């Protein structure tokens, strides 16, 4: 709504609180960890790691498999803030929700939008899942401790191979599991989907998402509703 004499510093006003927030601190911590790992020949024993190679992304410093995957995915949160994702990128969903709310809110003020943008960016979709695809095998992990391994054409669960998920997600383009494995199986069972549709849904291609929403699919609509109501602060 642009209360003039406040638009004069709105972007900078929000940025000043943004860089002091937890997301900025986590980005800085990730960059520092990567720099130290690169600079370290023998100063890398500090790096807990499950993969065949010591990587800052796979660092686990704080079921055992569930805890490892949760620790890894809570840091994969930053792959979204690294342009190292191909899907539809949970953070853009949160940003769209933020834009809609701040545009439709009658109580938002220029002095309140700072730190509101920050707590939105840091509390929107707190628990989010990430999947990695490799030669027809999909490894999905989540911040809530749930990990799955399955196939592409037929979503059939496989024993989860940690130390292969770690190396895959260290380098491979990570995907935001906007339609998670549970919803993928439910769709493929009740609404058996095409090879192309499954291919695109796994990679979180927006076209198929909007296609399914326009068809009024209860399953994908329920998933997206869960995500949106999860976008609270």
């Amino acid at each position: 709504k642009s209360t003039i004499d406040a638009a004069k510093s709105m972007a900078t006003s929000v940025m000043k609180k943004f860089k002091k927030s937890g997301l900025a601190n986590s980005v800085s911590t990730l960059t520092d960890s990567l720099s130290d790992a690169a600079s370290s020949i023998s100063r890398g024993a500090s790096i807990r790691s499950v993969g065949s190679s010591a990587s800052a992304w796979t660092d686990v410093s704080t079921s055992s498999i569930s805890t490892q995957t949760s620790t890894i995915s809570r840091r994969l949160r930053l792959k979204e803030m690294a342009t190292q994702t191909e899907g539809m990128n949970f953070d853009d969903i949160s940003a769209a929700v933020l834009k809609t709310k701040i545009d439709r809110s009658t109580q938002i003020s220029p002095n309140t939008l700072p730190d509101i943008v920050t707590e939105a960016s840091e509390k929107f979709i707190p628990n989010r899942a990430y999947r990695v695809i490799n030669n027809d095998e999909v490894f999905e992990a989540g911040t809530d401790g749930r990990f799955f391994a399955y196939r592409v054409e037929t979503f059939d669960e496989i024993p989860f191979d940690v130390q292969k998920f770690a190396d895959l997600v260290t380098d491979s383009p990570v995907i935001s599991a906007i339609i998670d494995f549970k919803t993928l199986k439910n769709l493929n069972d009740n609404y058996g989907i095409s090879r192309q549709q499954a291919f695109n849904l796994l990679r979180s291609d927006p076209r198929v998402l909007r296609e399914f929403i326009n068809q009024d699919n209860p399953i994908i609509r329920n998933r997206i509703e869960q995500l949106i109501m999860q976008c609270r602060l």
Partner: protein, 396 residues
């Protein structure tokens, strides 16, 4: 369908009757039927499964026949028959699965798969023999258009519906009057509540009505009627009609008064039961009309009088209820029921192979949507798939 059923029945009888040591007189006719099946299927190529994840399977038959002169069957005879039986059972199971995963708006009763369509050829009619199952008997009679019906234990005739209707209400929801019901499977629980306990009602009687329309005509039905709806007998917090707010329900159960259950067919009163509880018979009906009343106790003990004051606030809300369970019934159309596994079989087959949603059935084979919109086309396709499911369950 009759040929597929005959294949499955022949294989089941081969498993059951072709056993070591049995007299040949016990299996002479069965062996003749089995050899006829082998003869008819020989030289024919079949293809099953190109839908969803159901893999393409190709079937060829070049099996030898069985002996006919020995006196008692021995282990050699059974071993010879077992391999053929296994191959034929696999073929029939795959044909049944292929047919179960298909539908058509135009002709849902006709075969949809290529394999079953080929089995409808005249030359395969020689495989046909005894059609003694309930589903196949109904199939044949319905093809001839003869009066026939399926018998169901706890028929799944009511789509799920938990709802309420408020005849008297206001924004604070403090003096309400209405009915709340659950319609699920063979069960109807209805409860009429008055917050004022009919203090200002004429004759101190409040009348509640519940009308349930069945999507298909049930006949020769046994019903259990009980005077209390235990579902609506405890305190609840219920969403308003539009979800704007929530209201409080605090039932105190009074026995229902002037209970009348009317089973109607096309608006005509077929059966009527007044103040009758326990087992009742509804011979032919498509609608159930439950009329009950809340009557103020003319005489109240001090606690009962304390429950119901002359005016607001009303803290205890007087509720009457009814429970109506259809123990068994007969219906000309197929339905899910607590005893058979036809719906479960079809749903399992469709889910296991990710069958794309068709233009006839609801996605996921949801029974509530299926029975809510139980159209003639849906009925045709459902009878077809249920018969195929029974045929398959004969072996698998």
């Amino acid at each position: 369908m009759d040929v597929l059923y005959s294949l499955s029945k022949t294989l089941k009888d081969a498993r059951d009757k072709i056993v070591e040591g049995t007299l040949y007189s016990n299996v002479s006719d069965l062996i003749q039927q089995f050899n006829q099946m082998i003869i008819t299927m020989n030289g024919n190529e079949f293809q099953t499964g190109g839908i969803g994840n159901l893999p393409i399977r190709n079937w060829n038959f070049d099996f030898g026949l069985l002996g006919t002169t020995l006196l008692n069957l021995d282990a050699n005879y059974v071993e010879t028959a077992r391999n053929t039986i296994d191959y034929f059972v696999d073929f029939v199971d795959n044909v049944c699965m292929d047919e179960m995963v298909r539908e058509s708006q135009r002709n849902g009763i006709a075969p949809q798969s290529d394999s079953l369509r080929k089995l409808s050829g005249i030359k395969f009619k020689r495989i046909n023999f005894d059609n003694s199952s309930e589903y196949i008997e109904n199939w044949n009679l319905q093809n001839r258009r003869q009066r026939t019906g399926f018998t169901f234990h706890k028929p799944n005739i009511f789509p799920y519906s938990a709802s309420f209707t408020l005849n008297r209400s206001q924004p604070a929801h403090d003096n309400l009057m209405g009915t709340m019901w659950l319609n699920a499977g063979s069960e109807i629980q209805v409860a009429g509540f008055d917050y004022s306990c009919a203090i200002n009602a004429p004759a101190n009687i409040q009348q509640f009505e519940h009308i349930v329309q069945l999507r298909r005509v049930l006949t020769t039905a046994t019903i259990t009627l009980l005077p209390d709806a235990e579902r609506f007998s405890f305190p609840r917090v219920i969403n308003s009609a539009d979800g704007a707010t929530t209201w409080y329900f605090n039932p105190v159960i009074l026995r229902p008064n002037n209970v009348e259950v009317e089973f109607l067919l096309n608006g005509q009163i077929i059966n009527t039961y007044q103040a009758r509880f326990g087992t009742i018979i509804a011979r032919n009906f498509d609608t159930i009309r439950l009329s009950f009343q809340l009557m103020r106790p003319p005489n109240m003990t001090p606690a009962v009088a304390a429950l119901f004051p002359n005016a607001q606030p009303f803290e205890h809300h007087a509720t009457v209820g009814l429970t109506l369970r259809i123990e068994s019934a007969v219906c000309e159309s197929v339905l899910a029921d607590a005893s058979k596994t036809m719906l479960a079989n079809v749903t399992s087959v469709r889910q296991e192979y990710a069958i794309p949603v068709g233009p006839v059935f609801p996605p996921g084979m949801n029974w509530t949507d299926l029975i809510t919109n139980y159209s003639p086309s849906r009925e045709d396709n459902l009878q077809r798939v249920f018969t195929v499911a029974s045929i398959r369950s004969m072996l698998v």
